[PDB]
Design a protein around this nucleic acid. Structure first.
Length: 1353
DNA sequence: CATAAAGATGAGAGTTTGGCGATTAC
RNA sequence: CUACUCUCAAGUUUUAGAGCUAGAAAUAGCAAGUUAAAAUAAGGCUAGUCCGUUAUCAACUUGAAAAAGUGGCACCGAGUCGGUGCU
DNA sequence: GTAATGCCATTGTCTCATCTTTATG
C-alpha cells in the first residue's frame, strides 16, 4: 500500500529502510534463484549497503606525471645519443649498445661486461683516476687537453639526465649571485643611504662567517662579534637576521607603536615591507632587495661551498671536496676505532643488518639512521672531536647523491655543460655545430600551458599543432601553436561557479572580488553613538566614505582606526561601539594597493572604464606562471605604461581562485528592483542583506534566476549529474549507490513510487579553549589559574570549563563559586530546551540553582539582567563569551524572545545548509517525478525530504534509542528507519513547512501562520502550529520548562487542519523499538573487482622463489629481482585436472585461482589458454565462476564468510545484539558525560547499577556468537580470561572495553584490539578451501533479491 | 632575578589488511 | 573543491668499479666502501617526446558494446528470519 | 609433503615536549 523510504547516505555505507503509514517496516517473501533446495526467504525491508570508500584521483595523477617524466627523460637521452651517434661510430662501435645493456648479466649480455671501454684495464684506470663522475666533470670543465668522446658523452648525459630544478628563471652569474659581491653591494647601498655615522667593514670575512656550517643564531652572533660598532639589535644586525631566516623585530629600531615582524619565507612579506616602507619611505627598498638577494646568495652559497675561484665548476668541485672529506673522516674513523675500540668493528663495517657503515653504504640505512647509530660510539670514544661537530651539522661521511640535491638549480648544470662544450669545441666539430642543440636539450622544459604533446589520442591533452612532424626541443617554437594552446589551457583550467554554471569564476585576488567581500563584511557592521541608543545599519554614503577613506588607504583596517579616523574625523563622534566585527576586518583590498604601488596612478585605479583592463591583467597573472607567456599576454597594454612599471608588473604573481563569477556578482539583475548583488550590498535601505541572504530570500528574483539556470548546466545522464556535484569522489559513489538502492526498492514494491523519500547526509579543540581561558584571564586580571592550576586535559569537563569561562563567578548571583562542590551546582540553559535544542557551551551557564533565572519560561528576567549587565559586558569584551551568548543573556531587556527569534530557531533546526544535500534531493526528485499535466506544470508525486542529523540524534537521545556504532553495521539501517519516521511525522504534522524540507517550488508561508501568540492560544481553530519554538516537542509526553512547571501534551498527536493522527505515543514508540530490535537487517557488502597498482612497488633482490614477478619481459627474476605481493583483481573458481607425480596422472581438482590485476586482460582475452598455461587441463569452461572481492558464502549454522582474496576470507556475519544491551552499553560508557538533567542522570545511574549483570550477559552473548560463527577459540579464551581478570574495575571501563571487544565479532576483515592493556591479535582465515563446498550467495544491491548456488559439484 | 615567547633537537607516528616466508603440527 | 598541467631529488634493483694474504677446504687477518649505466608499474597500438593505478561492476537472458528486461498479496510471530491463509 | 599460525607496505609529512636564549618589568 502507501509507503515511504528513509535514506542515510555516507562515504562508506548507505542505510535504507521502507516504512508504512503506521511506522512499520514490511517483511516480505522473496524468490531465491539457483540450484539449491531453498526457493523462498522472508526478509525485512530494512538494510544498509556497505562498500569501500571511493578514492581521489591524486595518486593516479602523480603516477601519470611520473611516467611522463621518465619517458621524456629517456627521450632526452635518446636525443643526445642521436647527436653523438655518427661520430661515436668512428671511435667505438658498441659503446651505446653496451650502455643500454648495462643491466643484463654477462650470460644474457651479448657484448663485453665492461660498459665504458669494454676492457678491464681501462675500466680500473678510469675508476682510479675518477672515483666519482664529478671528478670527470671537473676535469672536463678545467682541462684544455683533448678528452675521449665517450667520457664527454658520460659527463653531458649525467648533466642532462639529472638536470636540476626550474624554480629560478633566467641567467645566473656571480655578479648578482655570489655572497661577496652582494655583501659589498649591500654595505655600499647602506653607506650611500646614510653617510653620517656610517659603518665601515673591511676586515670582516663575510663568506667565512655566513657560509659556515652552523646554526643561524650562532652565525648571526659570530658576525656581530666581528663588528664592534654594530650590535644585534641594530639595523644592520636585524637585516642580517632577516637574511638568515630568523624573525627580527624592528620596533626598537624605529620606536613604532605597532609590532612589525618580517619573515622572508612568509608569503606576505612584500606587502608587509610595503607597509614598513610606507612609514620610512621607499629609499630603503633597494636595500631590503639586496638583503633578499643576499638571502638567496646564502642558499646558493650552501650549494656553492667551493666557490674559491680556482675552478670553473662550483658543484663538481664541491662534490670532490665532499669526497675528499668523506675519505679523510672515514680513514680517521677506522683508525680511531681500531686503536681504541677493537671490539664491535664488524658491527660497524661488516654486519650491515643493524645500520652500520656497511648498512649506510650497502644496506637500507639512511643518513639520519647511520648518525643515530654512530652517535653513542663517537661519544664514548676519546679523540672524537671534529667528527661530532660534523655529525651535529649533518655533514659527516656524506654521499654525493643525497636528498639535499633537490635544491640545486639547473643553471649550474647548464653552466658546466656550456663549459665542457666550450673546452672541447675545436677538437670535435660536431660539438661546434650542435652546441645550442645540446644546451636546448638540457634547458628545454614543456610549459604548463602546452601540456602533453599528444596528437588526438590523449584524454588529458589539448595543444594545437602547426605542422605534422615529431616535436623536438629545437622545433617546439615553430610547431606548437602557443596561442591556441594557451587558449585551450584557459578554457580547461577555468572552473565554473557552483551557484551559476556556464560562467567562469573570478580569481581570488580580483579587484571586483575584493570589493565584493569587503562590502559583504562591512555591511554586517553596526555602530552605536552617544544618544540614539539603538543599532543602525550603515547607509550607502557611509559605506562609500569608509571604503574610500580607509580600505583604499591601508591594507588592514582595525576598529580603533575606524573609530579614530572616520567617526571622530567626519562624524565628530567621540565614543563609538561596534559589534559586527571583532579586532579588525578580515577582508582587504590587497590588489588595489599592489597595483597602486606598481603604476602609481590612484585616479586610474578608480576609473570605471578601466575595470575590464585591470581584471584582465589580474586574470593573466593568476592563470599563468611563465615569464614569456605573461610577456606575450601583456604586450597589448604596452602603450598605457612601459619599461619600468610594466617590468615590475610582470614580476608580480597571484595564486588562487574564488567561488563566485562575474555574472553573479554584477551581472544578473533583479527584475523589480533593477539592482545587482553588489548594488544591493552598497545600498539596501534600512535592513542590509548579505550575499547568502539574497540567495535565500525569496522576495527577490536572484533565487529564481539561480534555480532556473541550474538545469541548463546539468546533463541528461545520471553519471553527468553525479559528476557535476561539488564533493569528494567517495560521497559521489555513495550518492550513486543511494540512487540505485532507491531504484531497486521501488522495483521491489511493484513499481509503486513512494510518497516520501527522507534523506540524511551522514587535541586541537582543548588547546584552543585553554588558550581562550588564558587570554580571558590575562585580559581580566583574576589569577584563578594561580590558585587553581589546570591543564587542557582536565578542561573537557563541562562544569569546570564553564567555571573558568565565567571568571569563577556565578552568572546570576554576585557570589564566588565553590571549586570543589560542582555536583551540587546546576547547569542552566540560557534559552530553554522547550524552545530550541541547543546543548552546546554557547547556550549553557553554571549556577548554584536555576531558580535564580526567575519565574518566566523565557530568557532570564530583567531583574537579573539589569544587575549583571556590567559583568556580562566585561565578559563580552574579554572574549570569555561570544556575541550570540551575550545577546541571549540580555534578551529580556529588549522585551524577551520574539517571533523573529522563534522563526530563526525553526529555520536553524529545519533547513539544511549543505549544498550537496540539496543537489542529491534534486537528482532523486528529477528521477522520481517525471509526469506532467495539460499545462507546463511539473507533477510532484514523490516528495524528497531533507533532514538534519541533529534531529534523529536528539530523537535517539531523548527516547533511549541509543546508537553504538561498534556493535554491528545495523545502525546505518536503523538511522535510515528513524529518518523515515521523523520525516513522515514532520510532513504529517506541519504540511505548510514543506518549503523548508521538501525539495521544489513551494509556498512562501511566513511566521504569521505558524508561530502562536501565547501558550493558552495554541490556535487549533486558527492553524497556529506551536507556541514553543522546538519542532520536536510533539514526540515528548511531558515538557519541562526552565522553571520546573511540567507542561502536558495529548497522548495522541493529530494534525490540526485535516484531523489525521500523526503520532500515537504508546503504539508508535513500541513499534519503533520493535523495529530497532529486529535481528534480520539486510547488510550487503558491495562486491567489487579490485583495481589499481599491480603489486607492492618494492623492487626486491633476486631470490629462488616463483612468487617473484619480472620487471621486464626478459628479466628472469631469479637473476634480476623484481616485485612480489600482487593484488588479486578477482578470484576464479576452476574445476579441471592437474598433473600429479612423476607419472603425471591426471587428478580432478576444484580450487580458487587468484587472477592478479596484471593478469586480468590476458585471462579475459582467452581464459582457457591462460589456465592451460597455469597447468590446468580439461577445464570445465561453462562452470567457471567470477568471484570478486567480498563475495559471500554461507557454510553451516548461519555462519558466513566474505572473499578477501584467493587465499583468505573475512568475517561475514552480524551480531544482532538485543536493544537492552545496546542501551546499557551506551549508558555505562557515558557515565561521567551523561549531559542531561540531574533527575534524568540519577535514573540512568540507578539503571546502570541495578543492571550491572548485563556486563556478564553481553560477554556470554559474544562468547556464544563467536563459538557459533567466528571460531577463534584462542582469542575467545584470551577475552574471557581478561574479563575475569578485570571484573573488579569500574562499570564504565568494563563497558568501554566490551566496546573494544566487538571488533572480534564485527563484519569484515579481522583486526587487532585491546581489552584494557591486553592486546588481542587478529585471527585470520588463511584458507579458502572450505568455501569451495559452501553455498555462494549473489546479492542484489538491497540484498532482497538473491541467487544461492551450492558449489558442491 | 623572574617570567614569557620563539626556535631548535630529537620523539614518535604517518591506516588497513592482504602477501609471503618462517614456523609448527600431523 | 574536486579535477589538471609541467618538473625535480632521493629510494630500490641487476652489472661495472679486478679484492690482497694464508689454509685441502671450512674459516681467519686486512685492503677498499662515497660513483656510474639501465629500469622504475608487465606493457598497449593509435606509434604520440601518447596511453597504462580515478570513476564504473550481484545473478540470469539477448547483444562486440552503450543498454534493455527477470523475482505474488495479507496475518501471527522474531537469533540473522520462521510459520499459516489467499493467489 | 600438506595445511594452519610475524613482518612488511616508495617518498620529499606531520606535531609535541624540553631546553636555551632574549626581552621586559
Amino acid at each position: 500500500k502507501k509507503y515511504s523510504i528513509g535514506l542515510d547516505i555516507g562515504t562508506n555505507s548507505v542505510g535504507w529502510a521502507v516504512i508504512t503509514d503506521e511506522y512499520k517496516v514490511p517483511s516480505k517473501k522473496f524468490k531465491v534463484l539457483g540450484n539449491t533446495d531453498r526457493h523462498s526467504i522472508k526478509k525485512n525491508l530494512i538494510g544498509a549497503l556497505l562498500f569501500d570508500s571511493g578514492e581521489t584521483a591524486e595518486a593516479t595523477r602523480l603516477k601519470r606525471t611520473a611516467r611522463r617524466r621518465y619517458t621524456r627523460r629517456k627521450n632526452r637521452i635518446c636525443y643526445l645519443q642521436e647527436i653523438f651517434s655518427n661520430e661515436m661510430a668512428k671511435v667505438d662501435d658498441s659503446f651505446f649498445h653496451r650502455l643500454e645493456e648495462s643491466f643484463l648479466v654477462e650470460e644474457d649480455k651479448k657484448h663485453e661486461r665492461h660498459p665504458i671501454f669494454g676492457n678491464i684495464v681501462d675500466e680500473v684506470a678510469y675508476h682510479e683516476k675518477y672515483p666519482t663522475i664529478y671528478h670527470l666533470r671537473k676535469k672536463l670543465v678545467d682541462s684544455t687537453d683533448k678528452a675521449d668522446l665517450r667520457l664527454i658523452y658520460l659527463a653531458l648525459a649525467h648533466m642532462i639526465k639529472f638536470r636540476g630544478h626550474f624554480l629560478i628563471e633566467g641567467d645566473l652569474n656571480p655578479d648578482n649571485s655570489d655572497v661577496d659581491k652582494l655583501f659589498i653591494q649591500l654595505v655600499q647601498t647602506y653607506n650611500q643611504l646614510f653617510e653620517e655615522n656610517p659603518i665601515n667593514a673591511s676586515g670582516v670575512d663575510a663568506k667565512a662567517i655566513l657560509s659556515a656550517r652552523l646554526s643561524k643564531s650562532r652565525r648571526l652572533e659570530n658576525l656581530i662579534a666581528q663588528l664592534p660598532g654594530e650590535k644585534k639589535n641594530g639595523l644592520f644586525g636585524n637585516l642580517i637576521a632577516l637574511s638568515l631566516g630568523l624573525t627580527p623585530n624592528f620596533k626598537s629600531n624605529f620606536d613604532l607603536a605597532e609590532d612589525a615582524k618580517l619573515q622572508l619565507s612568509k608569503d606576505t612579506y612584500d606587502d608587509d615591507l610595503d607597509n614598513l616602507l610606507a612609514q620610512i619611505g621607499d629609499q630603503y627598498a633597494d636595500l631590503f632587495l639586496a638583503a633578499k638577494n643576499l638571502s638567496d646568495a646564502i642558499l646558493l652559497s650552501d650549494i656553492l661551498r667551493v666557490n674559491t675561484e680556482i675552478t670553473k665548476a662550483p658543484l663538481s668541485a664541491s662534490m670532490i671536496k665532499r669526497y675528499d672529506e668523506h675519505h679523510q673522516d672515514l680513514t680517521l674513523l677506522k683508525a680511531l676505532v681500531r686503536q681504541q675500540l677493537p671490539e664491535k668493528y664488524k658491527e660497524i663495517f661488516f654486519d650491515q643488518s643493524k645500520n652500520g657503515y656497511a648498512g649506510y653504504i650497502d644496506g637500507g640505512a639512511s643518513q639520519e639512521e647511520f648518525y643515530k647509530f654512530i652517535k653513542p660510539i663517537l661519544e664514548k670514544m676519546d679523540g672524537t672531536e671534529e667528527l661530532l661537530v660534523k655529525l651535529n651539522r649533518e655533514d659527516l661521511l656524506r654521499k654525493q647523491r643525497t636528498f639535499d640535491n633537490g635544491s640545486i638549480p639547473h643553471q649550474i648544470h647548464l653552466g658546466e655543460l656550456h663549459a665542457i662544450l666550450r673546452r672541447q669545441e675545436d677538437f670535435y666539430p660536431f660539438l661546434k655545430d650542435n652546441r645550442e642543440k645540446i644546451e636546448k636539450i638540457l634547458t628545454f622544459r614543456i610549459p604548463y600551458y602546452v601540456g602533453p604533446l599528444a596528437r588526438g589520442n590523449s584524454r588529458f591533452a589539448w595543444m594545437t599543432r602547426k605542422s605534422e612532424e615529431t616535436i623536438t626541443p629545437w622545433n617546439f617554437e615553430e610547431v606548437v601553436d602557443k596561442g591556441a594552446s594557451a587558449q585551450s589551457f584557459i578554457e580547461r583550467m577555468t572552473n565554473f561557479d557552483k551557484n551559476l554554471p556556464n560562467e567562469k569564476v573570478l580569481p581570488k585576488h580580483s579587484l571586483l572580488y575584493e570589493y565584493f567581500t569587503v562590502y559583504n563584511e562591512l555591511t554586517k557592521v553596526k555602530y552605536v553613538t552617544e544618544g540614539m541608543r539603538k543599532p543602525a545599519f550603515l547607509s550607502g554614503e557611509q559605506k562609500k566614505a569608509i571604503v574610500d577613506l580607509l580600505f583604499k588607504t591601508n591594507r588592514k583596517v582595525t576598529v580603533k582606526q575606524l573609530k579614530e579616523d572616520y567617526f571622530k574625523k567626519i562624524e565628530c563622534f567621540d565614543s563609538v561601539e561596534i559589534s559586527g566585527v571583532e579586532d579588525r576586518f578580515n577582508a582587504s583590498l590587497g590588489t588595489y594597493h599592489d597595483l597602486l604601488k606598481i603604476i602609481k596612478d590612484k585616479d586610474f585605479l578608480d576609473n570605471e572604464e578601466n575595470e575590464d583592463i585591470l581584471e584582465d591583467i589580474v586574470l593573466t597573472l593568476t592563470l599563468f606562471e611563465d615569464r614569456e607567456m605573461i610577456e606575450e599576454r601583456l604586450k597589448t597594454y604596452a602603450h598605457l605604461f612601459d619599461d619600468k612599471v610594466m617590468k615590475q608588473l610582470k614580476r608580480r604573481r597571484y595564486t588562487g581562485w574564488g567561488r563566485l563569477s562575474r555574472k553573479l556578482i554584477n551581472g544578473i539583475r533583479d527584475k523589480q528592483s533593477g539592482k545587482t548583488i553588489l548594488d544591493f550590498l552598497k545600498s539596501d535601505g534600512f535592513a542590509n542583506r548579505n550575499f547568502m541572504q539574497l540567495i535565500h530570500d525569496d522576495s527577490l528574483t536572484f533565487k529564481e534566476d539561480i534555480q532556473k539556470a541550474q538545469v541548463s548546466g546539468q546533463g541528461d545522464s545520471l553519471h553527468e549529474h553525479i559528476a557535476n556535484l561539488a564533493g569528494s569522489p567517495a560521497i559521489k559513489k555513495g550518492i550513486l549507490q543511494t540512487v540505485k538502492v532507491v531504484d531497486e526498492l521501488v522495483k521491489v514494491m511493484g513499481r509503486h513510487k513512494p510518497e516520501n523519500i527522507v534523506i540524511e547526509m551522514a587535541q586541537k579543540n582543548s588547546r584552543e579553549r585553554m588558550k581562550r581561558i588564558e587570554e580571558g584571564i590575562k585580559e581580566l586580571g583574576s589569577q584563578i589559574l594561580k590558585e587553581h592550576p589546570v591543564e587542557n586535559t582536565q578542561l573537557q569537563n563541562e562544569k569546570l570549563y564553564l567555571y573558568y569561562l565565567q571568571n569563577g563567578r556565578d552568572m546570576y548571583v554576585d557570589q564566588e563559586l565553590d571549586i570543589n562542590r560542582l555536583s551540587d551546582y546546576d547547569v542552566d540553559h540560557i534559552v530553554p530546551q522547550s524552545f530550541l535544542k541547543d546543548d552546546s557551551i554557547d547556550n549553557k551557564v553554571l549556577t548554584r540553582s536555576d531558580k535564580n533565572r526567575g519565574k518566566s519560561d523565557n530568557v532570564p528576567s530583567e531583574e537579573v539582567v539589569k544587575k549583571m549587565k556590567n559583568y556580562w559586558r566585561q565578559l563580552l569584551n574579554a572574549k570569555l563569551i561570544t556575541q550570540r551568548k551575550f545577546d541571549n543573556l540580555t534578551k529580556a531587556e529588549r522585551g524577551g524572545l520574539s517571533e523573529l527569534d522563534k522563526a530563526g530557531f525553526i529555520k536553524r533546526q529545519l533547513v539544511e545548509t549543505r549544498q550537496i544535500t540539496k543537489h542529491v534531493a534534486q537528482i532523486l526528485d528529477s528521477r522520481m517525478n517525471t509526469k506532467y499535466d495539460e499545462n507546463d506544470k511539473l507533477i510532484r508525486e514523490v516528495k524528497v525530504i531533507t533532514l538534519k542529523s541533529k534531529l534523529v540524534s536528539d530523537f535517539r537521545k531523548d527516547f533511549q534509542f541509543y546508537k553504538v556504532r561498534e556493535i554491528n553495521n545495523y545502525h546505518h539501517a536503523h538511522d535510515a528507519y528513524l529518518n523515515a519516521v521523523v520525516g513522515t511525522a514532520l510532513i504529517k504534522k506541519y504540511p505548510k513547512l514543506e518549503s523548508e524540507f521538501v525539495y521544489g517550488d513551494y509556498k512562501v508561508y511566513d511566521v504569521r501562520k505558524m508561530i502562536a501568540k501565547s501558550e493558552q492560544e495554541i490556535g487549533k481553530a486558527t492553524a497556529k502550529y506551536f507556541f514553543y519554538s522546538n519542532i520536536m516537542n510533539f514526540f515528548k509526553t511531558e515538557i519541562t520548562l526552565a522553571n520546573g512547571e511540567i507542561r502536558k501534551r495529548p497522548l495522541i498527536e493529530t494534525n490540526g487542519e485535516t484531523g489525521e493522527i500523526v503520532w500515537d505515543k504508546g503504539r508508535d514508540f513500541a513499534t519503533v523499538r520493535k523495529v530497532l530490535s529486529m535481528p534480520q537487517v539486510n547488510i550487503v557488502k558491495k562486491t567489487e573487482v579490485q583495481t589499481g597498482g599491480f603489486s607492492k612497488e618494492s623492487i626486491l633482490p633476486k631470490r629462488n622463489s616463483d612468487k617473484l614477478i619480472a620487471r621486464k619481459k626478459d628479466w628472469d627474476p631469479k637473476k634480476y629481482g623484481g616485485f612480489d605481493s600482487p593484488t588479486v583483481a578477482y578470484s576464479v573458481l576452476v574445476v579441471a585436472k592437474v598433473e600429479k607425480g612423476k607419472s603425471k596422472k591426471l587428478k580432478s581438482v576444484k580450487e580458487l585461482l587468484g587472477i592478479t590485476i596484471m593478469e586480468r586482460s590476458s585471462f579475459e582475452k582467452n581464459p582457457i589458454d591462460f589456465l592451460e598455461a597455469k597447468g590446468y587441463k580439461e577445464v570445465k569452461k561453462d562452470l567457471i565462476i567470477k568471484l570478486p572481492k567480498y563475495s559471500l558464502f554461507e557454510l553451516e549454522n548461519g555462519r558466513k564468510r566474505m572473499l578477501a582474496s584467493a587465499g583468505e576470507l573475512q568475517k561475514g556475519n552480524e551480531l544482532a545484539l538485543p536493544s537492552k544491551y545496546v542501551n546499557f552499553l551506551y549508558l555505562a560508557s557515558h557515565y561521567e558525560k551523561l549531559k542531561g538533567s540531574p533527575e534524568d542522570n540519577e535514573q540512568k545511574q540507578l539503571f546502570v547499577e541495578q543492571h550491572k549483570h548485563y556486563l556478564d550477559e553481553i560477554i556470554e552473548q559474544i562468547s556464544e556468537f563467536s563459538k557459533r560463527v567466528i571460531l577463534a577459540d584462542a582469542n575467545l579464551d584470551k577475552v574471557l580470561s581478561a574479563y575475569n581478570k578485570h571484573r573488579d574495575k569500574p562499570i564504565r571501563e568494563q563497558a568501554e572495553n566490551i566496546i573494544h571487544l566487538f571488533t572480534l565479532t564485527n563484519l569484515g576483515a579481522p583486526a587487532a584490539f585491546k581489552y584494557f592493556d591486553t592486546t588481542i591479535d587478529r585471527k585470520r582465515y588463511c584458507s579458502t578451501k572450505e568455501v569451495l563446498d559452501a553455498t555462494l550467495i549473489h546479492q542484489s544491491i538491497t540484498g532482497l533479491y538473491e541467487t544461492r548456488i551450492d558449489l558442491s559439484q
